[PDB]
Each structure stands twice: as C-alpha cells, then as structure tokens.
PDB file of N, CA, C and O in Angstrom:
ATOM      1  N   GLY A   1     -16.225 -27.710  53.700  1.00 58.60           N
ATOM      2  CA  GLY A   1     -16.927 -26.726  54.533  1.00 58.60           C
ATOM      3  C   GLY A   1     -16.810 -26.634  56.231  1.00 58.60           C
ATOM      4  O   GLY A   1     -16.284 -27.371  56.429  1.00 58.60           O
ATOM      5  N   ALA A   2     -15.197 -25.329  56.280  1.00 58.02           N
ATOM      6  CA  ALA A   2     -15.028 -25.095  57.701  1.00 58.02           C
ATOM      7  C   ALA A   2     -16.182 -24.841  59.200  1.00 58.02           C
ATOM      8  O   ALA A   2     -15.976 -24.362  59.856  1.00 58.02           O
ATOM      9  N   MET A   3     -17.627 -25.637  58.500  1.00 58.27           N
ATOM     10  CA  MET A   3     -18.639 -25.216  59.856  1.00 58.27           C
ATOM     11  C   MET A   3     -19.037 -27.314  60.209  1.00 58.27           C
ATOM     12  O   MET A   3     -18.026 -27.795  59.331  1.00 58.27           O
ATOM     13  N   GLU A   4     -19.229 -26.823  61.982  1.00 58.42           N
ATOM     14  CA  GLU A   4     -19.499 -28.402  62.029  1.00 58.42           C
ATOM     15  C   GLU A   4     -20.638 -28.146  63.838  1.00 58.42           C
ATOM     16  O   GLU A   4     -19.398 -27.255  64.625  1.00 58.42           O
ATOM     17  N   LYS A   5     -21.528 -29.798  63.782  1.00 61.34           N
ATOM     18  CA  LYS A   5     -21.898 -29.654  64.615  1.00 61.34           C
ATOM     19  C   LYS A   5     -22.135 -29.726  65.999  1.00 61.34           C
ATOM     20  O   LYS A   5     -22.845 -30.324  66.850  1.00 61.34           O
ATOM     21  N   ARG A   6     -20.388 -30.419  66.040  1.00 61.24           N
ATOM     22  CA  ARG A   6     -19.617 -30.366  67.355  1.00 61.24           C
ATOM     23  C   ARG A   6     -18.316 -30.241  67.495  1.00 61.24           C
ATOM     24  O   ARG A   6     -17.569 -30.259  66.485  1.00 61.24           O
ATOM     25  N   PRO A   7     -17.973 -29.969  69.118  1.00 59.34           N
ATOM     26  CA  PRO A   7     -15.933 -29.982  68.664  1.00 59.34           C
ATOM     27  C   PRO A   7     -15.431 -31.206  68.407  1.00 59.34           C
ATOM     28  O   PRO A   7     -15.927 -32.284  68.273  1.00 59.34           O
ATOM     29  N   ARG A   8     -13.982 -30.830  67.281  1.00 58.53           N
ATOM     30  CA  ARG A   8     -13.640 -32.145  66.936  1.00 58.53           C
ATOM     31  C   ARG A   8     -11.910 -31.272  67.050  1.00 58.53           C
ATOM     32  O   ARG A   8     -11.899 -30.971  65.883  1.00 58.53           O
ATOM     33  N   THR A   9     -11.235 -31.808  67.518  1.00 59.43           N
ATOM     34  CA  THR A   9     -10.077 -31.772  67.203  1.00 59.43           C
ATOM     35  C   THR A   9      -9.165 -32.083  65.982  1.00 59.43           C
ATOM     36  O   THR A   9      -9.211 -32.996  65.198  1.00 59.43           O
ATOM     37  N   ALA A  10      -8.589 -31.734  64.890  1.00 58.05           N
ATOM     38  CA  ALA A  10      -7.738 -31.637  64.058  1.00 58.05           C
ATOM     39  C   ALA A  10      -6.512 -32.360  63.626  1.00 58.05           C
ATOM     40  O   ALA A  10      -5.110 -32.188  63.655  1.00 58.05           O
ATOM     41  N   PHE A  11      -6.497 -33.861  65.243  1.00 54.28           N
ATOM     42  CA  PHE A  11      -5.595 -34.160  65.052  1.00 54.28           C
ATOM     43  C   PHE A  11      -5.068 -36.073  64.692  1.00 54.28           C
ATOM     44  O   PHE A  11      -6.789 -36.357  64.408  1.00 54.28           O
ATOM     45  N   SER A  12      -4.333 -36.522  64.076  1.00 53.18           N
ATOM     46  CA  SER A  12      -4.850 -37.856  64.162  1.00 53.18           C
ATOM     47  C   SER A  12      -4.686 -39.203  65.726  1.00 53.18           C
ATOM     48  O   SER A  12      -3.967 -38.712  66.666  1.00 53.18           O
ATOM     49  N   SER A  13      -5.250 -40.898  65.253  1.00 52.81           N
ATOM     50  CA  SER A  13      -4.654 -41.450  66.489  1.00 52.81           C
ATOM     51  C   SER A  13      -3.400 -41.971  67.141  1.00 52.81           C
ATOM     52  O   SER A  13      -3.120 -41.629  67.654  1.00 52.81           O
ATOM     53  N   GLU A  14      -2.807 -41.833  65.818  1.00 51.29           N
ATOM     54  CA  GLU A  14      -1.211 -42.104  65.401  1.00 51.29           C
ATOM     55  C   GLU A  14      -0.541 -40.828  66.801  1.00 51.29           C
ATOM     56  O   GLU A  14       0.052 -40.785  67.373  1.00 51.29           O
ATOM     57  N   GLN A  15      -0.789 -39.719  66.844  1.00 51.88           N
ATOM     58  CA  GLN A  15      -0.767 -38.479  67.240  1.00 51.88           C
ATOM     59  C   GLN A  15      -0.459 -38.115  68.901  1.00 51.88           C
ATOM     60  O   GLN A  15      -0.156 -37.838  69.635  1.00 51.88           O
ATOM     61  N   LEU A  16      -2.110 -38.364  68.997  1.00 46.86           N
ATOM     62  CA  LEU A  16      -3.122 -38.087  70.381  1.00 46.86           C
ATOM     63  C   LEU A  16      -2.394 -39.280  70.721  1.00 46.86           C
ATOM     64  O   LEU A  16      -2.517 -39.256  72.608  1.00 46.86           O
ATOM     65  N   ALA A  17      -2.040 -40.542  70.454  1.00 47.24           N
ATOM     66  CA  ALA A  17      -1.902 -42.210  71.166  1.00 47.24           C
ATOM     67  C   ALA A  17      -0.899 -41.625  71.793  1.00 47.24           C
ATOM     68  O   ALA A  17      -0.569 -41.355  73.713  1.00 47.24           O
ATOM     69  N   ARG A  18       0.449 -40.867  72.092  1.00 49.76           N
ATOM     70  CA  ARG A  18       1.736 -40.362  72.818  1.00 49.76           C
ATOM     71  C   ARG A  18       1.744 -38.622  73.289  1.00 49.76           C
ATOM     72  O   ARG A  18       2.576 -39.145  74.166  1.00 49.76           O
ATOM     73  N   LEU A  19       0.806 -37.994  72.926  1.00 46.30           N
ATOM     74  CA  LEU A  19       0.513 -36.544  73.707  1.00 46.30           C
ATOM     75  C   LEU A  19      -0.362 -37.468  74.896  1.00 46.30           C
ATOM     76  O   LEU A  19      -0.260 -36.218  76.176  1.00 46.30           O
ATOM     77  N   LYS A  20      -1.472 -37.969  74.504  1.00 48.38           N
ATOM     78  CA  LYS A  20      -2.061 -39.043  75.915  1.00 48.38           C
ATOM     79  C   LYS A  20      -1.125 -39.149  77.328  1.00 48.38           C
ATOM     80  O   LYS A  20      -1.555 -38.923  78.621  1.00 48.38           O
ATOM     81  N   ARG A  21      -0.244 -39.405  77.437  1.00 50.89           N
ATOM     82  CA  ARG A  21       0.852 -40.369  78.064  1.00 50.89           C
ATOM     83  C   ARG A  21       1.795 -39.448  78.777  1.00 50.89           C
ATOM     84  O   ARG A  21       2.443 -39.434  79.914  1.00 50.89           O
ATOM     85  N   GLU A  22       1.788 -37.982  78.168  1.00 52.77           N
ATOM     86  CA  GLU A  22       2.373 -37.059  78.743  1.00 52.77           C
ATOM     87  C   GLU A  22       1.419 -35.839  79.697  1.00 52.77           C
ATOM     88  O   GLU A  22       1.659 -35.287  80.729  1.00 52.77           O
ATOM     89  N   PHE A  23       0.033 -36.132  79.023  1.00 49.89           N
ATOM     90  CA  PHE A  23      -1.216 -35.532  79.319  1.00 49.89           C
ATOM     91  C   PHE A  23      -1.316 -35.713  80.824  1.00 49.89           C
ATOM     92  O   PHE A  23      -1.313 -36.394  82.009  1.00 49.89           O
ATOM     93  N   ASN A  24      -1.144 -37.043  81.244  1.00 51.97           N
ATOM     94  CA  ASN A  24      -2.103 -38.023  82.142  1.00 51.97           C
ATOM     95  C   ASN A  24      -0.060 -37.971  82.929  1.00 51.97           C
ATOM     96  O   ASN A  24      -0.785 -38.179  84.537  1.00 51.97           O
ATOM     97  N   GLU A  25       0.687 -37.858  82.603  1.00 48.37           N
ATOM     98  CA  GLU A  25       2.294 -37.401  83.513  1.00 48.37           C
ATOM     99  C   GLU A  25       2.187 -36.082  84.322  1.00 48.37           C
ATOM    100  O   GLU A  25       2.120 -35.624  85.299  1.00 48.37           O
ATOM    101  N   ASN A  26       2.056 -35.567  82.887  1.00 46.92           N
ATOM    102  CA  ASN A  26       1.945 -33.536  83.318  1.00 46.92           C
ATOM    103  C   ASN A  26       0.586 -33.179  83.414  1.00 46.92           C
ATOM    104  O   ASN A  26       1.012 -33.257  81.919  1.00 46.92           O
ATOM    105  N   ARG A  27       0.097 -31.945  84.019  1.00 44.24           N
ATOM    106  CA  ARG A  27      -1.109 -31.320  83.069  1.00 44.24           C
ATOM    107  C   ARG A  27      -0.396 -30.196  82.599  1.00 44.24           C
ATOM    108  O   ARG A  27      -1.877 -29.304  81.552  1.00 44.24           O
ATOM    109  N   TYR A  28       0.434 -29.389  81.646  1.00 42.18           N
ATOM    110  CA  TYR A  28       0.689 -28.285  81.733  1.00 42.18           C
ATOM    111  C   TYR A  28       2.299 -29.064  81.149  1.00 42.18           C
ATOM    112  O   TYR A  28       3.673 -29.506  80.675  1.00 42.18           O
ATOM    113  N   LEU A  29       2.959 -27.615  80.057  1.00 43.40           N
ATOM    114  CA  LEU A  29       4.260 -27.423  80.233  1.00 43.40           C
ATOM    115  C   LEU A  29       5.224 -26.553  80.299  1.00 43.40           C
ATOM    116  O   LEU A  29       4.863 -25.560  80.312  1.00 43.40           O
ATOM    117  N   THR A  30       6.264 -26.250  79.484  1.00 45.60           N
ATOM    118  CA  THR A  30       7.105 -25.436  79.974  1.00 45.60           C
ATOM    119  C   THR A  30       8.361 -25.136  78.613  1.00 45.60           C
ATOM    120  O   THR A  30       7.464 -25.975  77.463  1.00 45.60           O
ATOM    121  N   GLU A  31       8.372 -23.729  78.246  1.00 45.78           N
ATOM    122  CA  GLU A  31       9.417 -23.110  76.631  1.00 45.78           C
ATOM    123  C   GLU A  31       9.984 -24.444  76.005  1.00 45.78           C
ATOM    124  O   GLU A  31       9.603 -25.111  74.935  1.00 45.78           O
ATOM    125  N   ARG A  32      10.573 -24.888  76.861  1.00 45.42           N
ATOM    126  CA  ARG A  32      12.352 -26.153  77.263  1.00 45.42           C
ATOM    127  C   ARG A  32      11.771 -27.696  76.780  1.00 45.42           C
ATOM    128  O   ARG A  32      11.983 -28.283  76.235  1.00 45.42           O
ATOM    129  N   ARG A  33      10.482 -28.026  77.486  1.00 44.63           N
ATOM    130  CA  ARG A  33       9.489 -29.147  76.906  1.00 44.63           C
ATOM    131  C   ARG A  33       8.844 -29.398  76.206  1.00 44.63           C
ATOM    132  O   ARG A  33       8.955 -30.166  75.284  1.00 44.63           O
ATOM    133  N   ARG A  34       8.411 -28.094  75.482  1.00 48.02           N
ATOM    134  CA  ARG A  34       7.575 -28.108  74.382  1.00 48.02           C
ATOM    135  C   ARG A  34       7.805 -28.179  73.069  1.00 48.02           C
ATOM    136  O   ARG A  34       7.417 -29.030  72.134  1.00 48.02           O
ATOM    137  N   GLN A  35       9.479 -27.846  72.922  1.00 47.31           N
ATOM    138  CA  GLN A  35      10.216 -28.549  71.614  1.00 47.31           C
ATOM    139  C   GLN A  35      10.567 -29.301  72.008  1.00 47.31           C
ATOM    140  O   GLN A  35      10.925 -29.912  70.837  1.00 47.31           O
ATOM    141  N   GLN A  36      10.162 -30.733  73.167  1.00 47.16           N
ATOM    142  CA  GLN A  36      10.759 -32.245  72.483  1.00 47.16           C
ATOM    143  C   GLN A  36       9.187 -32.817  71.820  1.00 47.16           C
ATOM    144  O   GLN A  36      10.443 -33.652  70.764  1.00 47.16           O
ATOM    145  N   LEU A  37       8.636 -32.630  72.146  1.00 44.81           N
ATOM    146  CA  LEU A  37       7.246 -33.529  71.423  1.00 44.81           C
ATOM    147  C   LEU A  37       6.990 -32.670  70.392  1.00 44.81           C
ATOM    148  O   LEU A  37       6.270 -33.388  69.158  1.00 44.81           O
ATOM    149  N   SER A  38       6.851 -31.076  69.478  1.00 43.40           N
ATOM    150  CA  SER A  38       7.721 -30.303  68.496  1.00 43.40           C
ATOM    151  C   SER A  38       8.297 -31.376  67.406  1.00 43.40           C
ATOM    152  O   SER A  38       7.646 -31.569  66.780  1.00 43.40           O
ATOM    153  N   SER A  39       9.148 -31.517  67.816  1.00 41.90           N
ATOM    154  CA  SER A  39      10.456 -31.943  67.402  1.00 41.90           C
ATOM    155  C   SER A  39      10.306 -33.942  67.297  1.00 41.90           C
ATOM    156  O   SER A  39      10.380 -34.727  66.127  1.00 41.90           O
ATOM    157  N   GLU A  40       9.069 -33.979  68.564  1.00 41.44           N
ATOM    158  CA  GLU A  40       9.254 -36.090  67.894  1.00 41.44           C
ATOM    159  C   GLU A  40       7.712 -36.635  67.208  1.00 41.44           C
ATOM    160  O   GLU A  40       7.272 -37.745  67.086  1.00 41.44           O
ATOM    161  N   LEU A  41       6.409 -35.888  67.289  1.00 44.92           N
ATOM    162  CA  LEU A  41       6.103 -35.400  66.301  1.00 44.92           C
ATOM    163  C   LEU A  41       5.583 -34.749  65.391  1.00 44.92           C
ATOM    164  O   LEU A  41       4.454 -34.558  64.714  1.00 44.92           O
ATOM    165  N   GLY A  42       6.259 -33.031  65.079  1.00 41.89           N
ATOM    166  CA  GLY A  42       6.530 -32.858  63.989  1.00 41.89           C
ATOM    167  C   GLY A  42       5.419 -31.618  63.947  1.00 41.89           C
ATOM    168  O   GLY A  42       4.744 -31.579  62.690  1.00 41.89           O
ATOM    169  N   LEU A  43       4.780 -30.804  64.792  1.00 40.90           N
ATOM    170  CA  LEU A  43       3.770 -30.159  65.131  1.00 40.90           C
ATOM    171  C   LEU A  43       4.516 -28.203  65.613  1.00 40.90           C
ATOM    172  O   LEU A  43       5.171 -28.450  66.303  1.00 40.90           O
ATOM    173  N   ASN A  44       3.819 -27.481  65.815  1.00 39.28           N
ATOM    174  CA  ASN A  44       4.478 -26.153  65.923  1.00 39.28           C
ATOM    175  C   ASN A  44       4.369 -26.455  67.646  1.00 39.28           C
ATOM    176  O   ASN A  44       2.898 -26.917  67.661  1.00 39.28           O
ATOM    177  N   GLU A  45       4.860 -25.082  67.958  1.00 37.88           N
ATOM    178  CA  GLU A  45       4.292 -24.766  69.833  1.00 37.88           C
ATOM    179  C   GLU A  45       3.104 -24.800  69.995  1.00 37.88           C
ATOM    180  O   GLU A  45       2.109 -24.679  70.948  1.00 37.88           O
ATOM    181  N   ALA A  46       2.575 -23.588  69.304  1.00 37.71           N
ATOM    182  CA  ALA A  46       0.836 -23.203  68.649  1.00 37.71           C
ATOM    183  C   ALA A  46      -0.094 -23.907  69.519  1.00 37.71           C
ATOM    184  O   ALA A  46      -1.133 -24.057  70.038  1.00 37.71           O
ATOM    185  N   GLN A  47      -0.131 -25.347  68.629  1.00 36.48           N
ATOM    186  CA  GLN A  47      -0.930 -26.428  68.585  1.00 36.48           C
ATOM    187  C   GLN A  47      -0.517 -27.031  69.792  1.00 36.48           C
ATOM    188  O   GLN A  47      -1.619 -27.430  70.331  1.00 36.48           O
ATOM    189  N   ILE A  48       0.671 -27.374  70.049  1.00 33.67           N
ATOM    190  CA  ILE A  48       1.005 -28.117  71.254  1.00 33.67           C
ATOM    191  C   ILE A  48      -0.351 -26.902  73.074  1.00 33.67           C
ATOM    192  O   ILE A  48      -0.118 -27.683  73.829  1.00 33.67           O
ATOM    193  N   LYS A  49       0.633 -25.988  73.062  1.00 34.25           N
ATOM    194  CA  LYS A  49       0.005 -25.454  73.611  1.00 34.25           C
ATOM    195  C   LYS A  49      -1.513 -25.636  73.952  1.00 34.25           C
ATOM    196  O   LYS A  49      -2.294 -25.614  75.084  1.00 34.25           O
ATOM    197  N   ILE A  50      -2.318 -25.381  72.966  1.00 35.54           N
ATOM    198  CA  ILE A  50      -3.692 -25.172  72.492  1.00 35.54           C
ATOM    199  C   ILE A  50      -4.665 -26.157  72.745  1.00 35.54           C
ATOM    200  O   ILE A  50      -5.274 -26.506  73.745  1.00 35.54           O
ATOM    201  N   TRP A  51      -4.208 -27.447  72.449  1.00 34.15           N
ATOM    202  CA  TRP A  51      -3.485 -29.026  72.781  1.00 34.15           C
ATOM    203  C   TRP A  51      -4.191 -29.011  74.536  1.00 34.15           C
ATOM    204  O   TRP A  51      -5.525 -29.895  75.336  1.00 34.15           O
ATOM    205  N   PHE A  52      -2.600 -28.871  75.023  1.00 33.25           N
ATOM    206  CA  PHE A  52      -2.410 -28.682  76.477  1.00 33.25           C
ATOM    207  C   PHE A  52      -3.544 -28.728  77.827  1.00 33.25           C
ATOM    208  O   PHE A  52      -4.468 -28.278  78.225  1.00 33.25           O
ATOM    209  N   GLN A  53      -3.928 -26.898  76.752  1.00 36.42           N
ATOM    210  CA  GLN A  53      -4.673 -26.039  77.337  1.00 36.42           C
ATOM    211  C   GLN A  53      -6.113 -26.468  77.209  1.00 36.42           C
ATOM    212  O   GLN A  53      -6.681 -27.081  78.674  1.00 36.42           O
ATOM    213  N   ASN A  54      -6.740 -27.217  76.144  1.00 37.31           N
ATOM    214  CA  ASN A  54      -8.578 -27.220  76.281  1.00 37.31           C
ATOM    215  C   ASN A  54      -8.210 -29.251  76.635  1.00 37.31           C
ATOM    216  O   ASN A  54      -9.752 -29.057  77.365  1.00 37.31           O
ATOM    217  N   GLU A  55      -7.845 -29.764  76.873  1.00 40.75           N
ATOM    218  CA  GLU A  55      -7.915 -31.237  77.525  1.00 40.75           C
ATOM    219  C   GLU A  55      -8.355 -30.948  79.118  1.00 40.75           C
ATOM    220  O   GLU A  55      -9.204 -31.347  79.254  1.00 40.75           O
ATOM    221  N   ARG A  56      -7.701 -29.576  79.354  1.00 39.02           N
ATOM    222  CA  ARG A  56      -7.484 -29.485  81.022  1.00 39.02           C
ATOM    223  C   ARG A  56      -9.447 -29.700  80.881  1.00 39.02           C
ATOM    224  O   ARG A  56      -9.784 -29.951  81.861  1.00 39.02           O
ATOM    225  N   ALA A  57      -9.824 -28.323  80.254  1.00 40.45           N
ATOM    226  CA  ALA A  57     -11.106 -27.888  80.570  1.00 40.45           C
ATOM    227  C   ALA A  57     -12.218 -28.824  79.336  1.00 40.45           C
ATOM    228  O   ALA A  57     -13.553 -28.453  79.769  1.00 40.45           O
ATOM    229  N   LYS A  58     -11.563 -30.124  78.768  1.00 39.21           N
ATOM    230  CA  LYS A  58     -12.462 -30.968  79.147  1.00 39.21           C
ATOM    231  C   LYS A  58     -12.778 -31.387  79.957  1.00 39.21           C
ATOM    232  O   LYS A  58     -13.820 -33.270  80.053  1.00 39.21           O
ATOM    233  N   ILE A  59     -12.052 -32.299  80.668  1.00 36.90           N
ATOM    234  CA  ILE A  59     -11.627 -32.911  82.302  1.00 36.90           C
ATOM    235  C   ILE A  59     -11.876 -32.028  83.799  1.00 36.90           C
ATOM    236  O   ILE A  59     -11.309 -31.684  83.921  1.00 36.90           O
ATOM    237  N   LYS A  60     -13.067 -32.435  84.086  1.00 40.18           N
ATOM    238  CA  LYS A  60     -13.832 -31.418  85.411  1.00 40.18           C
ATOM    239  C   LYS A  60     -13.438 -32.211  86.699  1.00 40.18           C
ATOM    240  O   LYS A  60     -13.260 -31.403  87.607  1.00 40.18           O
ATOM    241  N   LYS A  61     -13.715 -33.386  86.707  1.00 43.42           N
ATOM    242  CA  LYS A  61     -13.175 -34.413  87.161  1.00 43.42           C
ATOM    243  C   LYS A  61     -11.680 -34.860  87.591  1.00 43.42           C
ATOM    244  O   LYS A  61     -11.322 -35.425  86.547  1.00 43.42           O
ATOM    245  N   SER A  62     -10.473 -34.800  88.837  1.00 47.36           N
ATOM    246  CA  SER A  62     -10.289 -35.643  88.828  1.00 47.36           C
ATOM    247  C   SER A  62      -9.932 -35.981  90.781  1.00 47.36           C
ATOM    248  O   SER A  62      -9.641 -36.700  90.520  1.00 47.36           O
ATOM    249  N   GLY A  63     -10.079 -35.246  91.283  1.00 51.30           N
ATOM    250  CA  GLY A  63     -10.414 -35.338  92.587  1.00 51.30           C
ATOM    251  C   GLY A  63     -11.321 -36.500  92.993  1.00 51.30           C
ATOM    252  O   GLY A  63     -12.427 -36.689  92.187  1.00 51.30           O
ATOM    253  N   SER A  64     -11.326 -37.215  93.866  1.00 51.49           N
ATOM    254  CA  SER A  64     -12.108 -39.343  94.224  1.00 51.49           C
ATOM    255  C   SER A  64     -13.659 -38.402  94.367  1.00 51.49           C
ATOM    256  O   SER A  64     -14.573 -38.973  94.206  1.00 51.49           O
TER     257      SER A  64
END
C-alpha cells in the first residue's frame, strides 16, 4: 500500500550517511556537482535535487 500517516524518505542509512556531510557544508547544489553524488551513491539527479530541497524545509533554525 503506497499510503502513510507520517512523512518518510524512501532512502537507506548507508546512503543518507554521505548526504548529511555535503548538506552540513553547503545547503544547495549546481549541475556540475549533482553528477558527483549521483555517480558516488548511484541515484538520479531528480532524487538528489528534491532531497536537498526538502532537508532545508525541515530545518527552520540555523541562526543562534
């Protein structure tokens, strides 16, 4: 069943582990950079763009 009562990312702990280390250093990406992560964890550009779009939108504090 494709229905769920909580938001949930269709990704692995092995695969979010290296994604966390690029999100912590820059909050965005460029076309030239998308293709590096896409070759190094085997995802499409659509999936990477969206992942970096919505990780911003969960984290509303960054100023102290």
